Design a protein around this ligand. Structure first.
Ligand SMILES: COc1ccc(S(=O)(=O)N(CC(=O)NO)CC(C)C)cc1
Ligand SMILES: [Ca+2]
Ligand SMILES: [Ca+2]
Ligand SMILES: [Ca+2]
Ligand SMILES: [Zn+2]
Ligand SMILES: [Zn+2]
Length: 159
């Protein structure tokens, strides 16, 4: 009749690669960040460095055409949205910061999971084990999973 994707296919693209780390690490963090949600949600993501994508990962520094935008080390870690026009879909990371794969300062992968969840279309959870929250909490990329709470939120992407 019939169903009915929303999306099904999430083609995504990076615009530039942060010099703080080597490119492979950069796409790796984001790749894995994507892959997280792609495991729990039926959303079938695909990074294409060449072609047309649904969403775009922005890396700017300071004022990039937002009011708040940026603030160097701290403040906003990153800003992304799903269900909105224009910018909606797209995910803006704090390039001005010094992101790390290891625990270091801020973990790229960690914030990425949060913002990429926004990209799917997630209204901020209220649980500290959940990653969707507006907050930040150091999580083991060893243990690597989502919270039961968070899992309800993400299943809410239908509906
Ligand atoms: C889970 O990873 C995160 C890292 C930093 C933040 S943040 O508190 O610095 N910040 C960015 C963010 O929440 N993006 O979705 C919100 C800002 C309002 C302080 C949030 C989440
Ligand atoms: Ca910042
Ligand atoms: Ca967009
Ligand atoms: Ca940087
Ligand atoms: Zn922005
Ligand atoms: Zn957020």
């Amino acid at each position: 009749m019939g169903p009915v994707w929303r999306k099904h296919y999430i083609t995504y693209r990076i615009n530039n690669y942060t010099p703080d780390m080597n490119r492979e690490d950069v796409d790796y963090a984001i790749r894995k960040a994507f892959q997280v949600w792609s495991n729990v949600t039926p959303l079938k993501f695909s990074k294409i460095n060449t072609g047309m994508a649904d969403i775009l990962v922005v890396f700017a520094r300071g004022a990039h055409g937002d009011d708040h935008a940026f603030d160097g080390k701290g403040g906003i870690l990153a800003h992304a949205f799903g269900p909105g026009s224009g910018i909606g879909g797209d995910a803006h990371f704090d390039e001005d910061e010094f992101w790390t794969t290891h625990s270091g300062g801020t973990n790229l992968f960690l914030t990425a999971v949060h913002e990429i969840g926004h990209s799917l279309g997630l209204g901020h959870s209220s649980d500290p084990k959940a990653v969707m929250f507006p907050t930040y909490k150091y999580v083991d990329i060893n243990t690597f999973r989502l919270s039961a709470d968070d899992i309800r939120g993400i299943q809410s992407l239908y509906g």
